[PDB]
Ligand binder design. Structure first.
Ligand code: HEM
Length: 147
């Protein structure tokens, strides 16, 4: 798992992407955009997005809700990453929050490489890009266990 320094560095580099209400939504939007471009069939699995296509999903109201809650969840896990017990608990709950019968463990897990590339591209440098991957590779399976 992340060392204290890796957590600090990642928080620093993600900070300017997760500060303002707008940036928090913006960050989440990009992640889902990447996800739906690779897997447009996942769109209909998000209840608020039903009927949208990849052509128009980014303009829905629903995607802003999802964008906000995604960014918030990622940041929350990052902030607790040095608390083994807490991050495990938070991660498990976020997995459980994926109640929809439309989403499976395997579908969830397929988002890992996509979110990894996205967040790596979003952060500034090599040290942050490596920390992103270590961070996501660690937390994806934690959440998926409860899906
Ligand atoms: C970094 C990894 C992820 C995190 C932290 C995350 C977080 C969340 C959170 C917090 C919610 C609840 C939002 C609410 O109603 O309050 C949610 C919903 C959802 N997520 Fe994720 N998610 C992640 C990855 C994915 C992936 C890759 C998929 C695609 C398989 C996915 C599919 C869904 C679906 C279908 C919902 C339910 C939308 C609803 O019921 O309205 N998530 N996600």
């Amino acid at each position: 798992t992340l060392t204290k320094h890796e957590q600090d560095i990642l928080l620093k580099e993600l900070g300017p992407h997760v500060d303002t209400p707008a940036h928090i939504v913006e960050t989440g939007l990009g992640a889902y955009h990447a996800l739906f471009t690779a897997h447009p069939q996942y769109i209909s699995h998000f209840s608020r997005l039903e009927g949208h296509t990849i052509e128009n999903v980014m303009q829905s109201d629903g995607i802003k809700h999802y964008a906000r809650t995604l960014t918030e969840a990622i940041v929350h896990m990052l902030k607790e990453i040095s608390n083994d017990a807490e991050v495990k608990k938070i991660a498990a709950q976020y997995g459980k929050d994926h109640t929809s019968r439309k989403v499976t463990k395997d579908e969830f897990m397929s988002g890992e490489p996509i979110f990894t590339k996205y967040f790596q591209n979003l952060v500034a440098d090599a040290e942050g890009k490596a920390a992103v991957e270590k961070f996501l590779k660690h937390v994806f399976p934690m959440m998926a266990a409860e899906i």
